[PDB]
Amino acid sequence: FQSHIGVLAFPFGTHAAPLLTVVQRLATSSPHTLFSFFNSAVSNSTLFNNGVLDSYDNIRVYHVWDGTPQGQAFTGSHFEAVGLFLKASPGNFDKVIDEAEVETGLKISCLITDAFLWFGYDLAEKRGVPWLAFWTSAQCALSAHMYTHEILKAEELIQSLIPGLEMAHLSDLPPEIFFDKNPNPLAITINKMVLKLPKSTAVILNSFEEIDPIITTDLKSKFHHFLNIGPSILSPPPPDDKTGCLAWLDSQTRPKSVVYISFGTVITPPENELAALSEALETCNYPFLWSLNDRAKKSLPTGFLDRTKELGMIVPWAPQPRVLAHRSVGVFVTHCGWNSILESICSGVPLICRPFFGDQKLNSRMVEDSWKIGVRLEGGVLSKTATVEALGRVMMSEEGEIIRENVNEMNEKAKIAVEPKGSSFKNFNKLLEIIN
Ligand SMILES: O=c1ccn([C@@H]2O[C@H](COP(=O)(O)OP(=O)(O)O)[C@@H](O)[C@H]2O)c(=O)[nH]1
Numbered sequence: 305f306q307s308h309i310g311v312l313a314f315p316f317g318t319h320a321a322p323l324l325t326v327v328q329r330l331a332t333s334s335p336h337t338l339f340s341f342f343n344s345a346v347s348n349s350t351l352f353n354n355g356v357l358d359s360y361d362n363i364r365v366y367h368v369w370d371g372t373p374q375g376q377a378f379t380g381s382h383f384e385a386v387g388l389f390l391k392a393s394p395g396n397f398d399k400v401i402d403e404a405e406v407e408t409g410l411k412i413s414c415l416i417t418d419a420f421l422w423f424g425y426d427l428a429e430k431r432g433v434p435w436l437a438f439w440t441s442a443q444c445a446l447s448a449h450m451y452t453h454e455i456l457k458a459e460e461l462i463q464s465l466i467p468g469l470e471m472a473h474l475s476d477l478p479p480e481i482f483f484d485k486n487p488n489p490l491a492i493t494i495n496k497m498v499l500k501l502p503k504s505t506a507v508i509l510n511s512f513e514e515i516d517p518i519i520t521t522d523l524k525s526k527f528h529h530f531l532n533i534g535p536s537i538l539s540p541p542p543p544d545d546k547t548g549c550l551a552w553l554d555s556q557t558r559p560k561s562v563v564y565i566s567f568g569t570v571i572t573p574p575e576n577e578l579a580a581l582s583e584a585l586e587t588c589n590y591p592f593l594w595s596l597n598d599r600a601k602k603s604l605p606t607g608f609l610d611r612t613k614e615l616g617m618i619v620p621w622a623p624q625p626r627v628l629a630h631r632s633v634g635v636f637v638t639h640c641g642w643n644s645i646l647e648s649i650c651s652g653v654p655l656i657c658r659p660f661f662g663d664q665k666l667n668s669r670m671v672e673d674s675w676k677i678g679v680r681l682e683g684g685v686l687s688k689t690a691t692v693e694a695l696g697r698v699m700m701s702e703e704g705e706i707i708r709e710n711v712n713e714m715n716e717k718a719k720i721a722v723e724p725k726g727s728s729f730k731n732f733n734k735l736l737e738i739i740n
Contacts, residue, residue: 305338305362308410309739312397312427314418315347315370316386318568318643319440321356322510323418325536326438331360333736339363340404340412342397344370344389355543366404369396383488390489394423401427414739416508419446422496425503434505434738437497441642442511443519443532444469444670445478445663449498450526452481468519471673476665502526506738510534510646512721512728515675515714529738531731532721535646537625539722539732549593549622553630556591560634563588563695564627564653566595567639571660575603577686581637582608584691585616590634590699592616593627628653635678635698637686640667652715654678654707656694658686677711679703 311327313320320343327339339360343351345367351357357365370385371392372378378385389396405411412433417424419437428435439446448455451466455477462477463470483491501507506529513520513532524530533539545551556562563585572578578596582604585592596618601609609618624644627633628651638644640659645667648655655678657668671678679697681690697703721728 305336305408305410307334307337307413307740308405308408309337309339309414309416310401310404310412311339311341311416312368312418312421312424313341313343313347314420314440315344315368315389316382318641319418319420320347320351321354322440322536322643323416323438324351324356326508326510326533327363327416328358328360329533329536329539329732330736330739331362333732334740335362337362337740338408338410340401340408341365342368342400342404344368346370364404364408366400368400371396387489390493393421394427397421397423397427416739419497419501419507420493422493422500425500435503436506436508436735436738437501437504438508440510441663442645442667442670443509443516443523444472444674445642445666446507446509447519447523448472448477448481448663448666449494450501450523452495452498455481456484467522468516468674472666472669476669478663478666480662502528505529506531506735508533508735510536510642512718512726513731514717514721514727515649516670529734531735533728533732533735535650535718535722535728537647537650538718539728542623542626545623545626547619547622549617549619549627550630552593552617553627553632556632559631560699561591562630562632563590563592563635563637563699564594564622564633565592565637566622566624566644567658567660568641568644569597569621571639572596572600573658573686578603579605579608580688581686581691582612583688584686584695586611587688587692588695588699589615590695591632593622593633594618595622595624596620625651635695640664640671642667645671646718649677649711649714649718652711654698654704654711656691656698657681658684675710675714676707677714678707 371388415428416436419439424435480491507527508531625647636648636653637656657680659665659668672680
């Protein structure tokens with residue numbers, strides 16, 4: 305190996321998966337570069353369980369201490385775990401970077417980091433190497449954080465001062481932005497990121513410029529290199545589907561007839577809201593495929609599972625990107641996580657938005673009011689009436705025809721971006737010039 309690149313993951317949520325995907329792409333393009341990937345054991349096992357992991361000659365995965373007591377089980381909240389990891393940082397990474405350098409016999413020449421890990425700037429500077437930051441969400445969420453100062457200083461005013469966020473409501477903003485008093489460790493970290501990010505060699509995103517040209521141009525003026533290289537899913541032969549999702553969708557005759565539902569792997573709405581959603585699915589009589597954990601499935605009305613045995617299918621896990629690409633899928637009821645939205649765009653599937661936390665509210669506002677590739681729910685929850693209305697609008701209405709043309713146009717823009725001469729194709733070659 306001629307080069308050794310250190311890559312530090314934020315070992316929570318869906319931060320580590322998209323960063324590893326980018327390392328896999330860089331590792332493919334740079335066979336003479338060794339990539340050392342630093343992540344928690346818990347996050348690494350999540351990656352192998354979700355099948356994101358693969359075996360490369362030039363990727364080595366290292367465990368970094370997650371700040372939890374060793375030997376005892378960890379029976380704490382996500383909040384506690386995030387606090388413990390941040391308290392253990394960056395010493396946890398420093399220790400393991402040094403052992404990577406001695407065991408490989410090569411000093412790091414470049415440090416790539418989740419943009420949350422603001423201390424990448426310090427770890428890079430100390431070693432005399434470039435710091436590249438990877439933002440795991442959309443440009444719109446990054447812009448909102450970068451304008452934290454201007455936002456706190458003072459609705460219409462905020463819409464008037466963030467280029468491209470004129471449709472955003474105050475309630476939509478990542479609320480870490482307002483955690484300004486006695487901030488939690490996560491809000492301290494994102495505030496320090498906002499201060500250090502402009503000193504990075506490059507900011508990298510799994511997005512494409514054309515989803516938000518005004519935000520993209522604005523953020524290019526804030527950073528040395530602002531590189532949209534996505535979607536990664538469009539720029540890896542699939543296994544076979546042991547869940548039965550694809551075989552079930554294949555038996556659905558009519559194209560764009562199926563409602564796909566997923567609130568991700570962890571969060572579900574209150575039991576009363578799962579009940580209201582189940583009633584809406586019965587009322588509409590659209591075939592549905594729902595990714596829902598077995599604990600949540602047991603809290604559904606007992607009559608619901610019996611009545612919908614021929615209408616729908618409920619599984620604890622779906623191969624989501626393969627589901628969304630199936631020609632029988634007509635709509636995606638989503639929590640509006642950025643990865644889920646981008647997968648939807650990449651397959652041309654319109655959205656019904658039920659956001660929960662973080663960037664999800666802002667993503668849902670962009671879906672309805674900027675991109676216009678889906679709808680939000682009247683009153684923000686999956687009430688029976690709001691859900692029946694949302695499914696009808698998207699699946700079979702004149703408003704649905706408008707949403708269909710908009711998601712097909714965004715789909716087309718995403719494909720052009722990753723094809724030769726595309727913005728993301730060009731930006732990825734720019735990133736290779738930096739890392740080599
Ligand atoms: O049954 C499921 C549910 C989710 N996912 C994947 O889990 C990720 C969720 O990421 P997202 O950014 O949307 O959610 P967040 O992690 O931000 O809450 C996406 O890549 C999905 O494809 C999956 O493969 N199968």
